[PDB]
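FAQ: What does a ligand-bound record look like?

Like this one, built around Kanglemycin A:
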Amino acid sequence: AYDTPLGITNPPIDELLSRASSKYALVIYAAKRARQINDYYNQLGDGILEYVGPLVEPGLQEKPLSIALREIHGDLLEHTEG
Amino acid sequence: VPGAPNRVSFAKLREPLEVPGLLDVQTDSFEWLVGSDRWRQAAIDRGEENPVGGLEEVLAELSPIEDFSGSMSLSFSDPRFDEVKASVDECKDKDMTYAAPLFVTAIKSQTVFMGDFPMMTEKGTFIINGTERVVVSQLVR
Amino acid sequence: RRLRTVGELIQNQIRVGLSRMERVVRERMTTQDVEAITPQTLINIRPVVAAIKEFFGTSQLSQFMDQNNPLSGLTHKRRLLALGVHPSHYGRMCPIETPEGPNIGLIGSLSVYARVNPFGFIETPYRKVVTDQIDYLTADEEDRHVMDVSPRQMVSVATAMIPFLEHDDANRALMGANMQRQAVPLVRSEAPLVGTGMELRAAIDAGDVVVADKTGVIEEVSADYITVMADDGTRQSYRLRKFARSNHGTCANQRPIVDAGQRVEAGQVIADGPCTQNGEMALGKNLLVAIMPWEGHNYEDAIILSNRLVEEDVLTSIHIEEHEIDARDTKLGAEEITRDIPNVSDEVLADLDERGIVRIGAEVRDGDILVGKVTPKGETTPEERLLRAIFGEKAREVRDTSLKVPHGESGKVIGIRVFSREDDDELPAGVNELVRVYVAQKRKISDGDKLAGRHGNKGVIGKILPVEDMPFLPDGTPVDIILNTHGVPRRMNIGQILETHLGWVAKAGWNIDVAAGVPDWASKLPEELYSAPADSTVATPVFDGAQEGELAGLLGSTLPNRDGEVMVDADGKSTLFDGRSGEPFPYPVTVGYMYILKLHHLVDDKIHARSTGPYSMITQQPLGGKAQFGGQRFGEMECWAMQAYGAAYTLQELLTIKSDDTVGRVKVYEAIVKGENIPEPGIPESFKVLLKELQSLCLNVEVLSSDGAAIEMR
Amino acid sequence: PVIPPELRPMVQLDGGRFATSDLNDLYRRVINRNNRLKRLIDLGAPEIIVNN
Ligand SMILES: CC(=O)O[C@H]1[C@H](C)[C@H](O)[C@H](C)[C@@H](O)[C@@H]([C@H](C)OC(=O)C(C)(C)CC(=O)O)CC/C=C(/C)C(=O)Nc2cc(O)c3c4c(c(C)c(O)c3c2O)O[C@](C)(O/C=C/[C@H](O[C@H]2C[C@@H]3OCO[C@@H]3[C@@H](C)O2)[C@H]1C)C4=O
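The answer part, i.e. the structure of the complex:
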């Protein structure tokens, strides 16, 4: 159902909450990954650190925070909860 | 009203007494204060025969101020007015205040000046520093 | 009821100025020997002139006059402060026009017929019972109390102008009074179609209308002035206020209503004021209304309007704002106002004249310079001097200080007043030049503007529909506004519906078509009320006005339109066609003409947006309330909601780098421009100021980490 | 201790007027009397004036 999510509401938070423990863990999850993607796109980030991404097919002008949400939705990355 | 438009009234009754000048609340007081000759026409259909002015009443109750050691004749009476310095348009344009200078005309008898005394316009307003002001009325017991 | 009147409360302030002046004449006459003393030399009039100067300037009773319409200024006068309900309040001072704010009960307006006794007592007029003589009623007349003078004794002017006042609730009646004194003058100034009899009497006495002093005939009629040739032979002339900026910025414009050949009697209206038409208050327009809810665009308070109102400038109003700038007597020397700006393009000053002031008639948008001005320099960067020397520009001092237009406003320049030092004029000490620029705006009605009627109803403009798609009568005549019904079954505001039907009765006329007498609903009616043509104004006094029976009788009589079809039934409803789908609306919808107003709250003034701007000196937080870029306040209540969501970062961003981080808000604007990650916030300046405030209180505070015992912010 | 000046500023207002915090007058109240006390002690003034 929910014929098709539009913009911010995609992906649904229900299908996202299965990838992490809490909604708060979801925030730090996608937020730090957005920092990694936006780094990679500008250029290599901090001292002696090579940053990767994006893993999923990027959108036309898709923001780095919207990409990281699609990455978590597909289980393309795991985090250490706590 | 002579030039009043035609407006059909659903009221079957009659109001004999026309509304008094709603602006008279401001004008009648300031005319009583300065002691205008128009308020002096209130003695034409007279009441109490004496038209004592507000400034005169304040000046008369204090007059004379008697020094304790020796008597001093400081009695003040018959205050004088001068025509208003400038028009309301000039006072609002030049940012000055609409006022008429007032000097008291009263043991030496040397007439003394007091200061610029603000005046009320026909609309019942005061121009104080180029701004049109209205003095509300206060209700105490 | 003391009722301190202006002159009487003026005199009381003169007492203090004279008494404190006499205290000096007692003391300073003793030290100096006699025969060197006169009432003149010893009396210093400063305490007397200071008291009156201190009264109008500092007194709460001396108020900045409120005039966006003649009624507001008329009701600002006659207002009274009650700080020191009952039977004595009836007929003396109505609690009906008390403000809706927390000051309710302390502030009220004088009744219509109230007269003031010389001692301060409020005298109500009445007729002893029904004797024809009118005597002053008061507490003295309350001892022997037996007939009132007239209805609406307890009703003020603002309240007496609401048709069908008896039907609405006291709250809605109160709000209606405040809504009327909030109206803005429209360029057209169309008179109300249905109303009371107070429009005429309140307009002329407001003072903003041109009244004839003596009977005569007009000699000349021009937009500038009007001359009247009296039979007595004397010559009177009246200069008309033309686009004069009011106290609150509403255009005060006077229109001559007479022609040269006309013969005018004394007391007649020669020209209309800003909000008057033909000598009676016109605070709004007459519009065709539909009370059907229309696809949620009029949801809950919102109102939908036809694009016709934007095209025909019916709700358009002129707004004028004054800007000022001054000259020398500065810190490091006297600055000069000049056209020359330090470094700008020739096209930026293209609209500036030889002096550097914006030329009249020119259009100005956000950021454009009005008055060019320079300041004395510090004359004390290396990287800027190099480019200066390379291309030849010089460190000509200077700091650019120009009066630009405030962000978010635009218009045309109507006039400039300049006060220079060369001419001898009066100005403050050291200030050489003073120039004031007046800019006018023709404001179209726009979505978001607040409209209201005389019954207290109010609401923003939800949407402006093109004239093509609107519920329209079978005539093809679209409705101007579309109201909603759901307000009634809690607040009930019945009067709003009554004038809506009478508005249609007056627009289309009527003829009772008497056959074998007159109907029973016309029993209490006069004969002149029958058979009126279209577009006829109507007067319904508050308590002696129309009644429900006569209304429906008029609803049954409707002069058809051009083709002879009847557009409204006896129920005041009609079958409207949806301008979008074309299908007719399944049920008959109530239509009519209601008198609505344009309130002073406008979208152009109430919209604010800020990305970066100036910051306060003591506290490094942003500062709103200046000519540009006001910042929004994030209170603790908002901080409580932000914590309830559990959003720690969002709360930290608002309170540190968006508000108080000295090095934070600059590095974020830098990172955003480069497109980098946003850095971690620092220490808010509010907290650093907190520590110093503690140290100045002799409290030794120390911020200790896990190690390195004490750290100093610096 | 004396609070830094930027937290108790004195700056020129619009139209040429001056503005300042109250702390400057309250600090001025203290330093004025503390100094006059030094003058009284060095003057050998009576104890009534000094203790006052
Ligand atoms: C700058 C100024 O002069 O403001 C004036 C006054 C507001 C202006 O006349 C203003 C133009 C006003 O006429 C219009 C305005 C549009 O209305 C509104 O602002 C709102 C938005 C609320 C209305 C609305 O849109 O809903 C329309 C007003 C219509 C109504 C039913 C109304 O408001 N009634 C009203 C409201 C009041 O609050 C007070 C009030 C007050 C006294 C003694 C009053 O009688 C008040 C009063 O009758 O005592 C207080 C504590 O303080 C007093 C403060 C000020 O007096 C000065 C007088 C001296 O001038 C300089 O030094 C003095 C200075 C220190 O105080 C007040 C009296 C105070 O709160």
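Follow-up question: can I read anything off the structure? Yes, for example: Residues 1-82 of chain A form one domain.
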